[PDB]
């Protein structure tokens, strides 16, 4: 394992400077991306907003999608 200079034995003499594809306080970490889910699933088109219900009747499926 010579010609390799392993990390477990590299005195602080040897040390590396991190380069761009890596986070560091000097260069800016530009924006990232995530997936935002469909919305609240329903039987009509999924929506983000919750609405009132006329027929409450615990455990029943009644809506007025058409407004």
């Amino acid at each position: 394992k010579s010609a390799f200079n392993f990390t477990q034995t590299t005195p602080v003499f040897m040390d590396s400077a991190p380069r761009w594809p890596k986070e560091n306080p000097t260069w800016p970490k530009n924006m990232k991306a995530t997936m935002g889910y469909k919305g609240i699933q329903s039987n009509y088109l999924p929506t983000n907003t919750v609405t009132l219900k006329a027929v409450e009747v615990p455990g029943t499926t009644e809506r007025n999608f058409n407004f």
Binding site: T51, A54, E56, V57, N64
Partner: protein, 431 residues
């Protein structure tokens, strides 16, 4: 969006309906012909494809003689003719006929209207019931109708503004009975039950309005001023907006105790309003005044478990919290131990409106109080006394049993009051 469905049952139900619906058509500039010269009204109406705004209410009764007046009066182009449901014969001041004989064949016609009325509102806040406990239509149908509303809708909020039999003033002899039978059907089916008596509002007409010729057309004009002050937050912008759900949440401690009183203030003629200033602290003192109660009950015999307050007009919160602070120090006013709080206060920038030819005064400040007190166990005991006074002789029974009933219905509905009596002392535990 913020939409409610108003119901009117019996005669008094529609005789207040002619007052409330004379108020809203006036409070939104709605001409009697439907039209006018958003959401300011969408609580109570619905535009059609042609100009008009039709109310989302239901006038239901077994007497054509009171419904046809609406069909002939100036407010006839308003209602969809189908909503004004009537009947061939009446209940004849008998709880049976309103519950077993006649009521059974028209409800389906009523419900098909309610269903057609539910879809047309996108968000339903809750039903409003204007009942008249003491007759056949008001009590018998109101009983049968409230049940069916619980099966079809369940936990939806149904308020109850039901005029109750008065101690002294009583225009009937059998109204003890059809009142008792009604209790179980309202208790287990209505969400909140405001009460008010025809006598209690008489004296308020005597002292305050000073109209020595009071009739029903006067009393109905008062209840309009209550609900307009109550549903202002549904259709008028104002600090501390308060809806129906917020209303019953912090007012009904137990599922059983949902009876409460009402008080409006100020109630002043058009001339003493010139001998006056009507400060927010003065009004709210006259609101908690027992003489300004809309029920013949005494608040100084019981304890306040919760109070609601709908102010209206040029009012700011700094003044509400200040006057309320005084009453909390007042010793005349008690409070049960387990509510150091006890006020849910509401404000509305829109002052109440006055009806031309009305008896109140144009004022820029008003207060409508509703309090859930335990003193209401009084007005609930006189009925317990008179019912047993007559039922010990089987008087008038052959009518009830002769129309598809038996005797058990009396004892059930009798005990339902007995159990409900002790609850009004249980909650006054103080330990």
């Amino acid at each position: 969006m913020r939409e409610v469905i108003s119901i009117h049952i019996g005669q008094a139900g529609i005789q207040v309906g002619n007052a409330c619906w004379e108020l809203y058509c006036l409070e939104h500039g709605i001409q009697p012909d439907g039209q006018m010269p958003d959401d300011a009204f969408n609580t109570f109406f619905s535009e059609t494809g042609a100009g008009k705004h039709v109310p989302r209410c239901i006038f239901l009764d077994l007497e054509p003689t009171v419904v046809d007046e609406v069909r002939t009066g100036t407010y006839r182009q308003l209602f969809h003719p189908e909503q004004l449901i009537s009947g061939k014969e009446d209940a004849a001041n008998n709880f049976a006929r309103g519950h077993y004989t006649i009521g059974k064949e028209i409800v389906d016609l009523a419900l098909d209207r309610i269903r057609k009325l539910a879809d047309n509102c996108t968000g339903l806040q809750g039903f409003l019931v204007f009942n008249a406990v003491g007759g056949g239509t008001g009590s018998g149908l109101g009983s049968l109708l409230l049940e069916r509303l619980s099966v079809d809708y369940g936990k939806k909020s149904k308020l109850g503004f039901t005029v109750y039999p008065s101690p002294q003033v009583s225009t009937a002899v059998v109204e003890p009975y059809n009142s008792v039978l009604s209790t179980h059907s309202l208790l287990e089916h209505t969400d909140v039950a405001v009460m008010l008596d025809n006598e209690a509002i008489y004296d308020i007409c005597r002292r305050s309005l000073d109209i020595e010729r009071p009739t029903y057309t006067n009393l109905n004009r008062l209840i309009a001023q209550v609900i307009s002050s109550l549903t202002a937050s549904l259709r008028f912008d104002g600090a501390l907006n308060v809806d129906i759900t917020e209303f019953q949440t912090n007012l009904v401690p137990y599922p059983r105790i949902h009876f409460m009183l009402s008080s409006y203030a100020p109630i002043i003629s058009a001339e003493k309003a010139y001998h006056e200033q009507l400060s927010v602290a003065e009004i709210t003192n006259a609101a908690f005044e027992p003489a300004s109660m809309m029920v013949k009950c005494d608040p100084r015999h019981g304890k306040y478990m919760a109070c609601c307050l709908m102010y209206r007009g040029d009012v700011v919160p700094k003044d509400v919290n200040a006057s309320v602070a005084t009453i909390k120090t007042k010793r005349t006013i008690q409070f049960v131990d387990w509510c150091p709080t006890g006020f849910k206060c509401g404000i509305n920038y829109q002052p109440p409106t006055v009806v031309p030819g009305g008896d109140l005064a144009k004022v820029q400040r008003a207060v409508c109080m509703i309090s859930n007190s335990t003193a209401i166990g009084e007005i609930f005991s006189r009925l317990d006394h008179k019912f047993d006074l007559m039922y010990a002789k089987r008087a008038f029974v052959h009518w009830y049993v002769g129309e598809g009933m038996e005797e058990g219905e009396f004892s059930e509905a009798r005990e339902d009051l007995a159990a409900l009596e002790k609850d009004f002392e249980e909650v006054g535990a103080e330990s």
